[PDB]
Symmetry: D2
Subunit: 460 residues, 4 copies
């Protein structure tokens, strides 16, 4: 990762998985440059430019044989990123030197590489998000019936289930999964367009034949594995593309942050905890992996303003005031999302529920929500008011003298509630207060979640 | 008055900027009508599932949907400090009263109203957006072959065409149209969910009947005009929907700002101007005032995206009420702003002024510096020499540059070539070698293909 | 009119005084006010302006015809020239001398600076009054022990007043910031179309000193200590960044406080004056305040040269909204701070249910002094903790670590004063003393200039 | 290598962009040095306060600040899960004599949180002279070009003439406000000191046997040694996260200014009026350095939402959900800012001005702005106002058509000069269109601004 004598990005050197790091590495970047020049030359041969099979063979064998030292020093001399690599690749491919980058300009390698990078980055996030959704869905099913105190205003609300509450987190990740897939499939190749998008150099190279330029653009698009290319660009693809991508990651950021806020709140209530590793026979447990996910999700929300501002200040066919900003924020958003999903998969595998803790809290709150079922079970005016005064004193005891709720007791002795004694244990059954929470979990998993997850069954 | 008094603050978004249609969809009249419209649909679905509601009770609601007493509603809200219940009383006062809102909570009306408002607001933006695109398309077709100086780094570069440049704007607006359409299509109804989304109150109402509660959830969803309803909600629909909606407006703001920034730059170059207003010739100096307003307003949209993002991130459990005030402001203001922008942008597109002679004058100044490759190629074809020509053209290029920079004169490079003996085997070809049209690449063909494949197919559903 | 949209901030949220500051009555009245000051200064410096013309203007500052002015703008397509003419119509004798030598931003930008300053002046007392009522609560509850929270997890005891000082300290930092931006706000003055004072220079036929003088006079009349030396058409949009930055910071502070109050309401240790609806309202609007900061940031980044008019419509929206939003928050925070209710028994319970686990060191250092070993006590205390933790977590019961230590024969010398070893006040450190010190050295001096009168 | 292998992502801020000094400030070698330097200060102060620390232990501690075993600490961190105790052990290992008195009575954030504040302040100290240095270069330029008339620009349309030096003062003023805000925030930065787990100083009070006086003066001593004038009286576990908001707010604002300057330079580059420095070894020159600054400034403006959101959701005495966000955003903000200023210093050094392209654009626009001047000269010679205004009006329409509908030069002056009606002012015409008389007070505004504001603001930094 490098020396401690200098600053190191905590995302690469500490947080993110090596795979995502490699996608944004200089090796991947410059390999892809060489790959693009190969596809270019191959297509140009087919279209009748003087390129031999020996020159193609030379380029194919030397895609990974990159001299970084020599390339960086040639940049210093030629003050050009692309020209330096054209020359370097030429030195290790002496037969091909005269045909590399023929007709093209800088953005053929620069911009198309970012597109290939963008796509590859989404492709690694997809199964990670799919794997989180699946494990939460496992958990959702097991705890689909378990009654838990609902919360609105973070206050005692009617009963829900742990499996129901989990399905709220799952659905947000599902909207995100659908969004990531939609953006990945819509990405288009820039292809060959020239300095200003007019294909003027390539038109001159193919001595004025429009049809040949059209074919060239089709051929590299397909070699690159892209279904579609832009008809219209300036020098580069429209920077709107980066907004579309980072908007969805920002949206994922906000969903994750919400999931982790919930878990941190439940971990205070002792109702649920993060998984442990290295475990066996501490009381105090910090939800550190959830606090980490929040911290990083935040940064993922912040980054969306960068591509927005960039897109707004692009003058005409392009200005280079996007270049540096894009080298930073694109990498960060993906490495940030990658980390979040790796850490979120850990949290989701074995979430620890504490049933008796959840049952205790419910018992403290249920007699204040069961009052209506007591009245509609007596066969109204003197039963709405005579139970109310008992609630007055029981609510006065809980707040003014912090402790247990004894409303059950106050009814269990009063003469007025004579017949309703025989049916109190059934009237205070927690599951009868949970509504369709169980039915809803089931139907959600079968109609929405399972159809979505199936294309990912190979890797779990 | 018909809006507000001068002695109080009035948002200029409502008073000075947006159209009456978009302003209506966010008004309290439309909001409280929609509340009554939801209560009506519920009662209809409730009766059709065998609940004790009379066909007379229904028609008293069906007739009194518009009849809203605004002073009584505000006083019962002064009494109970609860807006939904206050409107329940007021509707029952003019009606029936005992069957209003039965089994439902506040968010049956306060949350399904938002989704109807969002859907209708998107309905207002769509045809306005297609209209702009349509106008620019015609401008792009008309100007498809008019050579213009290309700009990278905002320095002169390979020529393009006005039509081609306009397609860059069109493309961005077409992606916005597609995103607005998708997000409107993907919008789902909350339906009947109860206080925490468990539907407990409606299960009680239908006496434990699971199938019946779901039958109600389907009935009110179709009545509201939605293809699909959420299975999973807390008290409200997920605040993620607000993010998808304002994300696409934010992106649209980005597009517009860029389009309008280009226009202001073109205006300075005097190559393009905004349409003429009337008088009773036109003035020499003209500020791109309408473009600057669009830029100003677009900026607001890009900013608003952070509101729904932060909101969604800190929603604890089934629901917290720290979304309420923030949503009252940012939802309406996003749409009101977008609406203003589209109205203004359409106005700009109707008769953009082009000045062909100014475009030509800038081209004649810059082109010779970009055309030396074509001069060398033409020499070699008639017995010339590459390195001899380069060095005997690099020197005249540096002389011409000096007059333009150090002296601030007109570019004389062509004139320096038109007399120089070394370039005698080329003099009959100089004007043809500097034909702007032969420098525009495939620009005009790109316009034609793009319009035929990607613009008219999208505009087809909006012909009227 | 319910048949049209109304800004919730404007209608049914913010104070009538703040709404008035951003009203058009106040705006156009200030325009007229600034024209009079310009006329007054110009007479002094020797232009043909008569006292009659000046009295005509001083009488008609509030006499504004919004119908006429609005109709004349449609015809002239100029907001300032529309109001020059309207003012000239109700002051026929003044007509020719209004706005003499001036440009549009003389009224446009100096009005926005007058508005900003006056809007800050309304924010300062309200904030001070909030800080003052939290300081009383802080003093009242300085000694009351409460459970400290790190990671939202039980942590070393603090006091209620000490926790309140965390909130106070954030608000005080905002108070100093609002005051520093207010006091160091500068006047645009008279600058001309591009900032070069060219027309004023020609109006006084070349007299440089007369232009400086005119600039000084209007600046003093408007109640500012300094004018900008350098401007384009307008004052730098960096000023709007600095103002909205401090309000955004205040937003973040407020949001933190109201989130803390919302969690305590869940813990039933504290309640709002009679669902923490007001704190949710506060959080929701604090959030919108934080959002706004990107507007002037984006604006100032893309101003080309002496002025571009892409700031105009965005400023009309973000400026007023930030102050109306700020205002609303402070009015609501004042109502929360007026009736905060702590429930001491609920707090006492939670402590007793969590203190035993944190008190493990004090029992050891009472045992080691009694003869026992640090090895032979840490081992025995851990097995009894393992037993207590099961009852709480696996059985959802009461923390009986206090009971279990009384039945174990090992801790026999320790029995005599377990009341003292688990006395919550001994676990609070310097909390109360930290409160008294902070209030007297930092808070009270800051509130000293206010509270008057 | 040391700047990372090409097989992994390497931040372009640390490797490619920022200066070495700023990179070292956020390096782990600086972080762990300071951690250890803070333990020394803690030990020295405690010994003075009567605790059992030997001067043998102080000297052993003082010698082993530089030599850090990173391999040991990382593996100890794996074994412990505590980053501080990992370095408490690794320090206690190489300093065996003083193993019992390292981190005595202290909490994790004594080193974590105070280090953050020390870095913040050293980073600000690197930025300030760099900012001053830039302002100073532009000042020189703005004095030199103080009387060079140039076309004013409102709406990006021709307007009343300013001077090149006056326009530069517009840029300088934004950077001077940035300088003022940076210094203030640097000086108003408070030390976290010794506060314990939740800010109550409980463990320190315990070790000083209930003595408040000794707690308070330990806080003051270590603050003094760290170089701070003032400590917080009130903290949770850490210093309030409102501090990070103040710091990144002023950087975002600097970013905003730098973006405006560089946008202006980019536009002037197109107009061929002004260019970025040569440093040669052509005709078309892209302003690549101004574009770099703009790109980097934009990111700086974006970062402000990090600390804002962070502060807004800090529950009670502290939550760890700020940790990861702060490591990225703070470091990145100072790396970017430093890079921007480095590039800005380079731009200021040898900015190229083209006086004859400036003169050309004036001659094209000025005649339209000089109409009232001409009518006044005509009336002064006993002429008719209404006839003169109508003549100018018609000649102005003809000349505008040539410019817009024919793409010609402005020929308004030549039309006036060949018209016999204008005979009374024909001799006055060169003088009437002297651009210098159209600049207002621009040349004096520069001198006043530089004397009264700039140089007094620069004096501490010379």
């Amino acid at each position: 990762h490098g020396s401690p004598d200098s600053y190191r990005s905590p995302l690469a050197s500490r947080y993110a998985s090596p795979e995502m790091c490699f996608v944004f590495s200089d090796r991947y970047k410059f390999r892809t440059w060489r790959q693009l020049w190969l596809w270019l030359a191959e297509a140009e041969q087919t279209l009748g430019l003087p390129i031999t099979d020996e020159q193609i063979r030379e380029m194919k064998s030397n895609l990974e044989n990159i001299d970084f030292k020599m390339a960086a020093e040639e940049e210093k001399r030629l003050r050009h990123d692309v020209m330096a690599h054209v020359h370097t690749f030429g030195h290790c491919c002496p037969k091909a030197a005269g045909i590399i980058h023929l007709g093209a300009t800088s953005c053929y390698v620069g911009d198309n590489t970012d597109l290939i990078i963008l796509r590859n980055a989404l492709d690694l996030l997809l199964p990670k998000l799919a794997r989180v959704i699946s494990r939460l869905a496992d958990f959702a099913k097991e705890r689909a019936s378990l009654p838990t105190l609902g919360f609105t205003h973070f206050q005692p609300a009617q009963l829900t289930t742990v499996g129901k509450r989990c399905c709220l987190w799952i659905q947000d990740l599902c909207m995100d999964l659908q969004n990531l897939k939609r953006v990945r499939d819509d990405l288009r190749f820039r292809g060959v367009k020239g300095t200003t998008g007019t294909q003027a150099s390539f038109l001159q190279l193919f001595e004025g034949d429009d049809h040949k330029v059209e074919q060239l653009d089709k051929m590299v698009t397909e070699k690159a594995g892209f279904k579609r290319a832009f008809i219209i660009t300036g020098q580069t693809y429209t920077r709107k593309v980066d907004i579309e991508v980072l908007s969805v990651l920002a949206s994922l950021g906000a969903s994750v942050h919400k999931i982790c806020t919930d878990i941190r709140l439940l971990a205070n209530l002792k109702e649920m905890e993060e998984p442990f590793e290295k475990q066996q026979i501490p009381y105090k447990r910090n939800p550190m992996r959830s606090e980490c996910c929040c911290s990083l999700a935040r940064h993922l929300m912040t980054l969306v303003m960068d591509p927005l501002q960039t897109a707004s200040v692009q003058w005409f066919e392009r200005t280079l005031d996007d270049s540096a900003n894009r080298r930073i924020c694109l990498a960060e958003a993906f490495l940030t999302a990658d980390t979040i999903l790796n850490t979120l998969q850990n949290i989701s595998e074995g979430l620890v529920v504490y049933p008796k803790v959840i049952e205790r809290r419910i018992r403290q709150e249920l007699p204040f929500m069961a009052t209506e079922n007591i009245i509609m079970a007596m066969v109204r005016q003197d039963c709405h008011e005579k139970i109310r005064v008992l609630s007055q004193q029981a609510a006065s005891v809980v707040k003014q003298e912090g402790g247990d709720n004894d409303l059950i007791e106050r009814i269990q002795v009063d003469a007025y509630f004579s017949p309703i004694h025989s049916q109190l244990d059934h009237l205070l059954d927690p599951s009868s207060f949970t509504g369709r929470a169980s039915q809803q979990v089931q139907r959600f998993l079968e109609e929405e979640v399972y159809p979505l997850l199936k294309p990912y069954e190979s890797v779990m």
